[PDB]
């Protein structure tokens, strides 16, 4: 029973103090409710140029990029091109180190290979050095025992998942995920002609944007505006309405539960908790001392298909940007919060939960 006016008030009353407390120059917010997105913009995209945030402003998604990676992988599974149960080495035969035996594509996709680190080392600058890195990696755990959140893990899953397609990652993503969903302002590389829409990120007063790195597209490199992001959330909320038959299955695969780690479940990029969930559960789970820790897992085998009564979410950050998306399929409500400052994840989660609580 929530009016447009009431929703607009709860968003303003939550976001205005958040931006003040967290020194955030600009935010674009979408709330999905009653089958439609509702857009709210605040502050500046570029302080020096005095450019306001608009619904066309592009923000760096950081790790929300992993949700695209997960869905693209799922789409490849649904085409018959890959299986999560396949050995990693099926897709990279040059990866001959015997520590790789028993490590599945599932493990790469869900951070359970056995201690792959948060980042691909900066000294890795091409495929040969990327191979050397993986060949020299000494797993700290057996496969399927420990979750360690890692770009070096899901980044490689993304790269290998598109090999059978024959397309480079960017083209596979655009052809198979972005274009079918009409996400026409979502970019791995922002064309010169669209650069005027690209916000500056801000860190400690300084303007910054994300730098190139190995496996950046697959782990943290996507830029988008709040409209394309609202439409991404809507496709993930209600995949039954997506026309492309492999893509709708890929969305389901990305929201399936593969592992339980405490009160959360790992999907492909997406993370889930059972709905109903209290704020403290989700807020506390997002603290870096939990989220970046190596933690034991319980296998969900076979994987559980998408549970509609879920809090489905993902944080994403770069040096200058902080974003969050969350949705509850049972209730068909969801939220996107894009900001040009990286501020603490628990603050993102608290604000999002508060706003969605208003819609029941
Ligand atoms: B990704 O955003 O996920 C984690 C942080 C989070 O929960 O948002 C770890 C960092 C990931 N992002 C990147 O690796 C991209 C960055 C570039 C510079 C700082 S983060």
From Swiss-Prot:
- Enumerate the residues binding substrate: 314-316
| InterPro entries, A to Z | Bact_CellWall_Synth/Modif, Beta-lactam-related, Beta-lactam/transpept-like, Beta-lactam_class-C_AS
Q: Chief subcellular site? A: periplasm
Question: What are its E.C. numbers?
Answer: 3.5.2.6
What general EC class does the enzyme of this chain belong to?
A: hydrolase
Q: Which Pfam families match?
A: Beta-lactamase
The family database entries (PROSITE patterns) matched by this protein are listed as: BETA_LACTAMASE_C (PS00336)
What exactly does this protein do? This protein is a serine beta-lactamase with a substrate specificity for cephalosporins.
Entry protein name: Beta-lactamase
Q: Which organism is it from?
A: Enterobacter cloacae
User: By which gene is this protein encoded?
Assistant: ampC
């Amino acid at each position: 029973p929530v009016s447009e006016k009431q929703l607009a008030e709860v968003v303003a009353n939550t976001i205005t103090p958040l931006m003040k407390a967290q020194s955030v120059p600009g935010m674009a917010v979408a709330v999905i409710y009653q089958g439609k997105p509702h857009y709210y913009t605040f502050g500046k995209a570029d302080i020096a140029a005095n450019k306001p945030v608009t619904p066309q402003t592009l923000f760096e998604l950081g790790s929300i990029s992993k949700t695209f990676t997960g869905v693209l992988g799922g789409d490849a599974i649904a085409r018959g091109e890959i299986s999560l149960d396949d050995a990693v080495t099926r897709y990279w035969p040059q990866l001959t180190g015997k520590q790789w035996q028993g490590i599945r594509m599932l493990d790469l996709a869900t951070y359970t290979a056995g201690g792959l680190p948060l980042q691909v080392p900066d000294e890795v600058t091409d495929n040969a050095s990327l191979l050397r890195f993986y060949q020299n990696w000494q797993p700290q755990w057996k496969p399927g025992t420990t979750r360690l959140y890692a770009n070096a893990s899901i980044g490689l899953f993304g790269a290998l998942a598109v090999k059978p397609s024959g397309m480079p990652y960017e083209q596979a993503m655009t052809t198979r995920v972005l274009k079918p969903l009409k996400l026409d302002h979502t970019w791995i590389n922002v064309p010169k002609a669209e650069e005027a829409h690209y916000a500056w990120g801000y860190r400690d007063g300084k303007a910054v944007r994300v730098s190139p790195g190995m496996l950046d597209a697959q782990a943290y490199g996507v830029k988008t505006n709040v409209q394309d992001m609202a439409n991404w959330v809507m496709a993930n909320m209600a995949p039954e309405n997506v026309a492309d038959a492999s893509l709708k299955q890929g969305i389901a695969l990305a929201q399936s539960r593969y592992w339980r780690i405490g009160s959360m479940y790992q999907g492909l990029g997406w993370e889930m908790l059972n709905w109903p969930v209290e704020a403290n559960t989700v807020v506390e789970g997002s603290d870096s001392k939990v989220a970046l820790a190596p933690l034991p897992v319980a296998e969900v085998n076979p994987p559980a298909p998408p549970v509609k009564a879920s809090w489905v979410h993902k944080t994403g950050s770069t040096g200058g940007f902080g974003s969050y998306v969350a949705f509850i399929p049972e209730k068909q409500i969801g939220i996107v919060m894009l900001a040009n400052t990286s501020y603490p994840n628990p603050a993102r989660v608290e604000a999002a939960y508060h706003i969605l609580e208003a819609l029941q």
